[PDB]
């Protein structure tokens, strides 16, 4: 009350919650990127110099 | 002795919010690391 305003308690609790969610989202983004079809070149028609038709 | 927030009507909503966040994050991590491929 001397320094911090009224909503500082809710702001600090929401900051802890958002930091935990941000850590989880970063781990999730790293895992999805290392398992993604773009990274692993999956389900993409890789272009050939002749475009041979199987 | 009783806790600090004993008798507060927001305690069980915030406990359900924390447990819901934990189970959603756990299920999402399980999906990404086991059922994603």
């Amino acid at each position: 009350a001397q320094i911090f305003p009224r909503n500082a308690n809710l702001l600090s609790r929401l900051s802890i919650f958002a930091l935990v969610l941000l850590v989880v989202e970063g781990i999730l983004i790293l895992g999805v990127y290392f398992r993604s079809n773009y990274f692993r070149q999956v389900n993409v028609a890789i272009e050939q110099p002749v475009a041979f038709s199987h | 002795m009783q806790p600090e927030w004993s008798g507060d009507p927001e305690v069980k909503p915030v406990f359900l919010a924390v447990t819901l966040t934990g189970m959603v994050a756990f299920l999402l991590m399980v999906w990404l690391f086991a059922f994603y491929w």
Binding site: F17, V32, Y33, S36, N37, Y38 | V14, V18, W31
Partner: peptide
């Protein structure tokens, strides 16, 4: 406030499903 926790969890869930779908894009 638990309602802001619920809204932040919903935002995190929506963004995570967008991330998963972009991984399977």
């Amino acid at each position: 406030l638990s309602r802001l926790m619920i809204a932040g969890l919903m935002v995190f869930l929506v963004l995570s499903l967008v991330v998963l779908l972009a991984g399977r894009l």
